[PDB]
Amino acid sequence: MISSLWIAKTGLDAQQTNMDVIANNLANVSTNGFKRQRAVFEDLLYQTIRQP
Amino acid sequence: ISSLWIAKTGLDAQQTNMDVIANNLANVSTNGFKRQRAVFEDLLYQTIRQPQTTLPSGLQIGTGVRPVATERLHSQGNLSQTNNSKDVAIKGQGFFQVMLPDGTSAYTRDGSFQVDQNGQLVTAGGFQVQPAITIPANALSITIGRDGVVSVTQQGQAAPVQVGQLNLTTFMNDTGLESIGENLYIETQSSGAPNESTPGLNGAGLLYQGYVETSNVNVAEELVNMIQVQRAYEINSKAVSTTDQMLQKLTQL
Amino acid sequence: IESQAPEKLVYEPGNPLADANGYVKMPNVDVVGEMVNTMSASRSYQANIEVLNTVKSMMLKTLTL
Amino acid sequence: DHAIYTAMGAASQTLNQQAVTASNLANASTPGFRAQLNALRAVPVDGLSLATRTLVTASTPGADMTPGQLDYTSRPLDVALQQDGWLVVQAADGAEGYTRNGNIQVGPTGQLTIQGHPVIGEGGPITVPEGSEITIAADGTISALNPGDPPNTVAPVGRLKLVKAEGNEVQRSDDGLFRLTAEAQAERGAVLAADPSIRIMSGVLEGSNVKPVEAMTDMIANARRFEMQMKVITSVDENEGRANQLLSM
Numbered sequence: 001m002i003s004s005l006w007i008a009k010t011g012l013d014a015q016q017t018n019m020d021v022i023a024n025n026l027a028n029v030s031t032n033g034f035k036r037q038r039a040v041f042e043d044l045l046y047q048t049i050r051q052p
Numbered sequence: 053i054s055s056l057w058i059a060k061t062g063l064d065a066q067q068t069n070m071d072v073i074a075n076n077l078a079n080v081s082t083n084g085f086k087r088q089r090a091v092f093e094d095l096l097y098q099t100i101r102q103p104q105t106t107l108p109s110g111l112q113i114g115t116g117v118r119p120v121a122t123e124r125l126h127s128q129g130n131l132s133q134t135n136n137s138k139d140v141a142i143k144g145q146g147f148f149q150v151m152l153p154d155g156t157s158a159y160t161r162d163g164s165f166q167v168d169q170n171g172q173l174v175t176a177g178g179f180q181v182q183p184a185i186t187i188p189a190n191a192l193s194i195t196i197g198r199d200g201v202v203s204v205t206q207q208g209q210a211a212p213v214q215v216g217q218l219n220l221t222t223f224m225n226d227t228g229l230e231s232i233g234e235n236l237y238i239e240t241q242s243s244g245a246p247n248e249s250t251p252g253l254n255g256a257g258l259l260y261q262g263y264v265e266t267s268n269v270n271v272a273e274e275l276v277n278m279i280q281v282q283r284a285y286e287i288n289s290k291a292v293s294t295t296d297q298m299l300q301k302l303t304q305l
Numbered sequence: 306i307e308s309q310a311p312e313k314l315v316y317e318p319g320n321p322l323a324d325a326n327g328y329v330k331m332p333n334v335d336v337v338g339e340m341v342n343t344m345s346a347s348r349s350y351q352a353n354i355e356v357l358n359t360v361k362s363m364m365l366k367t368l369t370l
Numbered sequence: 371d372h373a374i375y376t377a378m379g380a381a382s383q384t385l386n387q388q389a390v391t392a393s394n395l396a397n398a399s400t401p402g403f404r405a406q407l408n409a410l411r412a413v414p415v416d417g418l419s420l421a422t423r424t425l426v427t428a429s430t431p432g433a434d435m436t437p438g439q440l441d442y443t444s445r446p447l448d449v450a451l452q453q454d455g456w457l458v459v460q461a462a463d464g465a466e467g468y469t470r471n472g473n474i475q476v477g478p479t480g481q482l483t484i485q486g487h488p489v490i491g492e493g494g495p496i497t498v499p500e501g502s503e504i505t506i507a508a509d510g511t512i513s514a515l516n517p518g519d520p521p522n523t524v525a526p527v528g529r530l531k532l533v534k535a536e537g538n539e540v541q542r543s544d545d546g547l548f549r550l551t552a553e554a555q556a557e558r559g560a561v562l563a564a565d566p567s568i569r570i571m572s573g574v575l576e577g578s579n580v581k582p583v584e585a586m587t588d589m590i591a592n593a594r595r596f597e598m599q600m601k602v603i604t605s606v607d608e609n610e611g612r613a614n615q616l617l618s619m
Contacts, residue, residue, distance in 0.1 A: 001398050001399075001438060001439075001577060001578055001579065001580050001581075001582070002582070003067055003068075003070065003071040003074070003439065004070050004071060004073075004074035006439040006440070006441050006577065007071070007074040007075060007078050007439065008074055008077075008078065009441065009442075010078060010441070010442045011074075011077065011078035011079075011080075013442055013444075014078070014079075014081070015081075018081065038134060038136075040083065040164050040176050041079065041081060041082045041083075042082065042177070042233075042234050042235050043079050043082060043085065043233055043234065043235060044233055044440065044442075044571070044574065045232075045233040045437075045440070045450065045452065045453075045571065046231060046232065046233055047436070047437050047453065048453060049119070050318060050319065051318060051327070052318050052323075052325060052326055052327035053336075053591065054313065056587055056590065056591060057315055059587075060583060060584065060587045061316065063583045064581075064583060067583070095316050095328075096314065096326075096328065098311065098313070098314075099311075100310075100311075115314070115315065115316065116315075116316065118316055152569075153508065153509050153569075154509070154566045154567060154569075177508075178508075233571070234571075292586075292587070292590070296590055296594075299590075299594045300594070300597075302336065302337060302340070303594060303597035303598055303601065304597075319434065319436075321538065336598065340598070340601075343602060343605055344605075347605050347608070347609050350609050350613065351609070351612060354612060354613055354615070354616050357616055358615070358616060361616075361619070365619070
């Protein structure tokens with residue numbers, strides 16, 4: 001186990017999906033009656049360290 | 053073994069620092085996010101021996117380093133245009149209020165609102181906005197001015213009809229807020245008792261329609277801190293290696 | 306007797322043994338000290354064994370007067 | 371002569387602690403895993419005079435409840451608990467075990483399961499429709515949508531049961547499901563109550579929590595202590611062997 005690997009992986013996944021929706025929006029620029037899409041992100045759960 | 057314990061504490065501290073750096077880097081495109089920086093401190097000091105001109109000749113051994121807190125830089129982020137008509141951005145201080153499913157109340161900062169099937173105003177995720185603004189059907193246009201008033205127009209109406217006001221809350225000390233997941237904060241003992249107010253009064257902020265507040269993450273700062281964390285980790289591993297060499301030689305002889 | 310030197314203490318809040326400050330006490334043992342104590346004790350043991358052997362031999366030979 | 375026994379016991383307990391650490395390291399990727407702590411306890415023996423023997427026996431207080439990271443697999447029915455959430459499942463003998471492994475599987479007959487153990491929610495072991503898509507809410511509600519049906523036919527079908535445990539009152543079992551200790555069980559009842567303060571999220575799966583730095587330091591310390599104990603054994607044996615010559619005449 002390592003702390004930052006599974007955080008950077010999630011960041012890569014988020015950027016990948018953002019690029020995916022951008023490419024989808026760009027692909028159908030000549031279609032009729034289409035609406036652009038925007039993805040919204042959010043942070044995951046937080047772990048609290050207990051202090052004295 | 054004392055060196056081993058001290059170096060273990062140092063490695064754990066560096067691990068937590070790298071963790072918070074990675075967390076800041078990950079959500080670089082999350083609306084209404086504030087960066088965090090971790091602060092460390094020393095542990096207790098052992099006094100093994102009490103103290104013409106010579107050195108004082110006193111011994112005082114350290115113990116190690118522990119992380120104390122992670123402070124969030126509640127600065128002002130940039131505003132990016134999404135061209136939508138139901139998105140708002142905070143200019144200054146203040147947090148929105150939303151209701152969790154169990155019944156308690158939690159506060160958010162980013163603005164990205166949809167309208168549920170009934171007509172009420174909810175955030176992206178289903179949580180209902182506490183002031184409970186309801187937008188009826190046939191809403192030709194929705195307006196959210198620099199003040200909290202929300203006004204909807206209708207078919208063949210000379211003047212728009214007001215459907216509520218979006219007051220927002222303020223805290224005495226916002227750095228002490230507890231940040232649960234999903235872009236939410238809950239009141240704690242650290243932060244003072246929140247007080248709600250209309251925008252533009254009692255130090256509250258102003259609402260801009262059609263813009264969202266981006267996170268204030270400094271990529272160059274994070275990269276430099278990451279390089280320093282890696283180098284400090286490499287330095288600290290040498291302490292463990294040398295202590296291991298000493299112990300192995302002692303056991304052998 | 307227990308050594309009067311102050312025991313070490315390390316930081317560990319997630320342990321029920323920790324006090325109000327999150328410090329758990331650990332023994333103060335000098336590993337090198339114990340090693341050299343074992344060495345010196347073994348050598349003195351050998352010396353006493355040799356002394357006893359020689360004295361036993363002399364006592365045994367005394368009876369041949 | 372008996373000073374050899376304390377040293378050999380220390381060496382054996384060091385070997386046991388090394389085995390525990392190796393077991394912790396081995397399953398460094400099993401989802402919903404809790405590491406095993408370890409410590410050494412002094413056990414002095416009170417004889418008649420000059421109490422100079424203090425043995426040592428390895429002991430494991432229990433699992434440390436620091437949550438690990440969670441991978442975003444985007445799977446619709448993968449849940450991750452909160453700081454102290456616990457999915458309640460039915461074990462092999464009917465006891466209610468607690469886990470953090472959110473990887474939920476569905477059988478052919480719509481029966482939910484986790485590693486062969488049927489998860490119990492509000493009521494009994496919850497069973498969803500035969501082949502419907504399943505979605506988990508932010509607080510444990512289960513929604514089912516029969517495939518092919520219009521999207522406005524999604525219906526709640528059950529609710530999970532999530533309990534909150536502090537962490538210092540739960541002990542591991544042989545199968546690997548945490549259960550309350552005797553005192554905590556007496557104080558809070560035989561079976562816990564589904565508190566509504568716990569919230570979960572779908573699409574993510576929590577990993578294990580094992581610290582490589584702690585593992586490495588523990589292994590190094592164990593090796594060094596073993597070497598020192600072996601040296602003590604050698605010295606005691608040599609001294610006794612040379613002392614037995616005194617017995618001759």
